[PDB]
Structures are given as structure tokens and as C-alpha cells.
Design an enzyme around this catalytic site. Structure first.
Site, PDB file in Angstrom:
ATOM      1  N   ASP A   1      -4.609   5.937  -8.022  1.00  0.00           N
ATOM      2  CA  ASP A   1      -3.646   5.636  -6.634  1.00  0.00           C
ATOM      3  C   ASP A   1      -2.135   5.040  -7.215  1.00  0.00           C
ATOM      4  O   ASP A   1      -2.183   3.945  -7.564  1.00  0.00           O
ATOM      5  CB  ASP A   1      -4.596   4.402  -6.048  1.00  0.00           C
ATOM      6  CG  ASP A   1      -3.765   4.278  -4.628  1.00  0.00           C
ATOM      7  OD1 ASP A   1      -2.814   4.764  -4.421  1.00  0.00           O
ATOM      8  OD2 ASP A   1      -4.684   3.720  -3.647  1.00  0.00           O
ATOM      9  N   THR A   2      -1.392   5.786  -6.974  1.00  0.00           N
ATOM     10  CA  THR A   2       0.175   5.439  -7.463  1.00  0.00           C
ATOM     11  C   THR A   2       0.572   4.325  -6.577  1.00  0.00           C
ATOM     12  O   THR A   2       1.581   3.947  -6.802  1.00  0.00           O
ATOM     13  CB  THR A   2       1.025   6.807  -7.289  1.00  0.00           C
ATOM     14  OG1 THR A   2       0.920   7.497  -6.218  1.00  0.00           O
ATOM     15  CG2 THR A   2       0.402   7.875  -8.539  1.00  0.00           C
ATOM     16  N   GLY A   3      -0.128   4.337  -5.286  1.00  0.00           N
ATOM     17  CA  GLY A   3       0.279   3.545  -4.274  1.00  0.00           C
ATOM     18  C   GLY A   3      -0.127   2.038  -4.580  1.00  0.00           C
ATOM     19  O   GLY A   3       0.418   1.089  -3.984  1.00  0.00           O
TER      20      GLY A   3
HETATM   21  N1  LIG Z   1      -4.164  -3.672  -6.092  1.00  0.00           N
HETATM   22  C1  LIG Z   1      -4.499  -3.049  -4.715  1.00  0.00           C
HETATM   23  C2  LIG Z   1      -3.551  -3.498  -3.722  1.00  0.00           C
HETATM   24  C3  LIG Z   1      -3.440  -2.881  -2.446  1.00  0.00           C
HETATM   25  C4  LIG Z   1      -4.149  -1.488  -2.268  1.00  0.00           C
HETATM   26  S1  LIG Z   1      -4.226  -0.739  -0.723  1.00  0.00           S
HETATM   27  O1  LIG Z   1      -4.429  -1.596   0.270  1.00  0.00           O
HETATM   28  O2  LIG Z   1      -4.992   0.137  -0.624  1.00  0.00           O
HETATM   29  N2  LIG Z   1      -2.569  -0.300  -0.609  1.00  0.00           N
HETATM   30  C5  LIG Z   1      -1.930   0.689  -1.556  1.00  0.00           C
HETATM   31  C6  LIG Z   1      -3.046   1.641  -2.003  1.00  0.00           C
HETATM   32  N3  LIG Z   1      -2.948   2.945  -1.085  1.00  0.00           N
HETATM   33  C7  LIG Z   1      -4.361   3.300  -0.806  1.00  0.00           C
HETATM   34  C8  LIG Z   1      -4.607   4.001   0.492  1.00  0.00           C
HETATM   35  N4  LIG Z   1      -5.121   3.539   1.493  1.00  0.00           N
HETATM   36  C9  LIG Z   1      -6.764   3.416   1.943  1.00  0.00           C
HETATM   37  C10 LIG Z   1      -7.549   2.967   0.560  1.00  0.00           C
HETATM   38  C11 LIG Z   1      -7.539   1.988   0.115  1.00  0.00           C
HETATM   39  C12 LIG Z   1      -8.035   1.708  -1.127  1.00  0.00           C
HETATM   40  C13 LIG Z   1      -8.867   2.385  -1.532  1.00  0.00           C
HETATM   41  C14 LIG Z   1      -9.067   3.720  -0.892  1.00  0.00           C
HETATM   42  C15 LIG Z   1      -8.480   4.178   0.056  1.00  0.00           C
HETATM   43  S2  LIG Z   1      -4.382   2.826   2.762  1.00  0.00           S
HETATM   44  O3  LIG Z   1      -5.103   1.893   3.700  1.00  0.00           O
HETATM   45  O4  LIG Z   1      -3.053   2.490   2.242  1.00  0.00           O
HETATM   46  C16 LIG Z   1      -3.985   4.286   3.787  1.00  0.00           C
HETATM   47  C17 LIG Z   1      -5.025   4.868   4.496  1.00  0.00           C
HETATM   48  C18 LIG Z   1      -4.790   6.228   5.250  1.00  0.00           C
HETATM   49  C19 LIG Z   1      -3.548   6.847   5.103  1.00  0.00           C
HETATM   50  N5  LIG Z   1      -3.067   7.929   5.797  1.00  0.00           N
HETATM   51  C20 LIG Z   1      -2.505   6.193   4.354  1.00  0.00           C
HETATM   52  C21 LIG Z   1      -2.634   5.095   3.663  1.00  0.00           C
HETATM   53  C22 LIG Z   1      -1.787  -0.849   0.682  1.00  0.00           C
HETATM   54  C23 LIG Z   1      -0.778  -0.297   1.234  1.00  0.00           C
HETATM   55  C24 LIG Z   1      -0.660   0.105   2.558  1.00  0.00           C
HETATM   56  C25 LIG Z   1       0.382   0.735   3.029  1.00  0.00           C
HETATM   57  C26 LIG Z   1       1.863   1.014   2.488  1.00  0.00           C
HETATM   58  C27 LIG Z   1       1.756   0.462   0.952  1.00  0.00           C
HETATM   59  C28 LIG Z   1       0.359  -0.160   0.436  1.00  0.00           C
HETATM   60  C29 LIG Z   1      -4.925  -1.111  -3.396  1.00  0.00           C
HETATM   61  C30 LIG Z   1      -4.956  -1.630  -4.511  1.00  0.00           C
END
Ligand SMILES: Nc1ccc(S(=O)(=O)N(CCNCCN(Cc2ccccc2)S(=O)(=O)c2ccc(N)cc2)Cc2ccccc2)cc1
Ligand SMILES: [Cl-]
Ligand SMILES: [Cl-]
Lengths: 99, 99
Positions: A25-27
Site C-alpha cells: 500500500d503506497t498510500g
Molecule cells: N499506517 C496506515 C495508516 C492509514 C492507513 S488507511 O486508513 O488505509 N489510509 C491509507 C491507505 N489506503 C488504503 C485503502 N483504503 C481501504 C483499506 C485500508 C486498509 C487496508 C485495506 C484497504 S481507503 O479506505 O483509503 C480507500 C477505500 C476505497 C477507495 N476507493 C479508496 C481508498 C487512509 C487514507 C485515506 C484517504 C486518503 C489517504 C489516506 C493504512 C495504514
């Protein structure tokens, strides 16, 4: 390896002698794993998700293998929909985004 | 380009005449942007993971450009804390993970 994104980038990791599936997860700034037992002491960590901030446990200097690449770093533990490998370990294993 | 992961992988996008900053997120199935106007029909959707779910509006067949690359795809619009480019558009620009 080169991993395309037509499907979720799920890979096998090894931690605590156990194989697990995790999402690259690059996010994600940090690595967050499903509830599991880890050694040593942990510290509190607040992380921000799409639905708000939550509390997780931080373990430092933990051995973890990602697609067979060995790493040692910080791992957070808490209620995540799936194990996620974030930039802290993606950088260690030399991961980049390319197009 | 080759984008490092030492920092959050933020790029400029252009959508609906607007220029925005957005996170390249391999862990997101779909693109989600903060509240904005988009043309055409939409349907409600709930998306979530860490810290909960949020309600968004799903717009399909939206034109977007990412780093000069033009693509078409679904864009979710709602109260996301940060603009995210998801796999559904990452594939179209030929973006891969490499290590
Ligand atoms: N250390 C750490 C801290 C926070 C996170 S996070 O909360 O997951 N996160 C960043 C990672 N994105 C994962 C994708 N998403 C769902 C997920 C979450 C975890 C596992 C599987 C799937 S999501 O909820 O972001 C999502 C769901 C659906 C779509 N279409 C887009 C994004 C928040 C973020 C939200 C918006 C902007 C920027 C950042 C992870 C790790
Ligand atoms: Cl605590
Ligand atoms: Cl680390």
C-alpha cells in the site's frame, strides 16, 4: 519483481515464523497488521484512516519478510481490513512506483 | 517516471478543469477525491477501512489526466481526508510497483 495493479497487490509476508497475505500500500505511511502476538514492548500510535483516527500498537525493530525480501522495522498492530505493508518497509525493500 | 516512496507519492492531476494534488495509492481499489462537481450521473457508495466508512458519490467514465497521461475511469467523490488515485486509474497510466 514488477507488480501491475489490475488486481490487488496482495503478497506473502513472513512474520513470527508465520506466512500471511498482505497488501502493498503506497498510500500507507506505516505498516499495519491484523492482531497477532509480537515480542518486546509496544508504544501507542494514532493513525488516520479514511473514516478517522484510531489507536494501534507499535512494535519496533521487528523481523519481517516481504515476497522473500528480508526486513527489520516498525510494525503496527490493530483492526485493519487487511494486513498492509506501508512505505516504511516498502522503501527498505527498494520499492518504487513506475510509469 | 520512477517515483520514490521515501515521501508520500503525490502528483498533480487535472480533472473537471480543476488541478488537484493526489496520493498514488496501490491499496485503493478506486480513486476518491474531496468534494467537487462532476458531470453526469452518479450512484451512492460506502467506502471504508481504517477508522470507518464514508459515503461517496460514484461517477463513471470520467476523464482525468495524471502526469500528462490521459485516462478514463470511475471517480468517487466525498469527504476523504486526502485525494487518492486508486488502482482503477493507476492501471490506465501503466503504473507498476517495482523492487
Ligand atoms: N499506517 C496506515 C495508516 C492509514 C492507513 S488507511 O486508513 O488505509 N489510509 C491509507 C491507505 N489506503 C488504503 C485503502 N483504503 C481501504 C483499506 C485500508 C486498509 C487496508 C485495506 C484497504 S481507503 O479506505 O483509503 C480507500 C477505500 C476505497 C477507495 N476507493 C479508496 C481508498 C487512509 C487514507 C485515506 C484517504 C486518503 C489517504 C489516506 C493504512 C495504514
Ligand atoms: Cl494505548
Ligand atoms: Cl521502519
Amino acid at each position: 519483481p514488477q507488480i501491475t495493479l489490475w488486481q490487488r497487490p496482495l503478497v506473502t509476508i513472513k512474520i513470527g515464523g508465520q506466512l500471511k497475505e498482505a497488501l502493498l500500500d503506497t498510500g500507507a505511511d506505516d505498516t499495519v497488521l491484523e492482531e497477532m502476538s509480537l515480542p518486546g514492548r509496544w508504544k501507542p500510535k494514532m493513525i488516520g484512516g479514511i473514516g478517522g483516527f484510531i489507536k494501534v500498537r507499535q512494535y519496533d525493530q521487528i523481523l519481517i519478510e516481504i515476497c522473500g525480501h528480508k526486513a527489520i522495522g516498525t510494525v503496527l498492530v490493530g483492526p485493519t481490513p487487511v494486513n498492509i505493508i506501508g512505505r516504511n518497509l516498502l522503501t527498505q525493500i527498494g520499492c518504487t512506483l513506475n510509469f
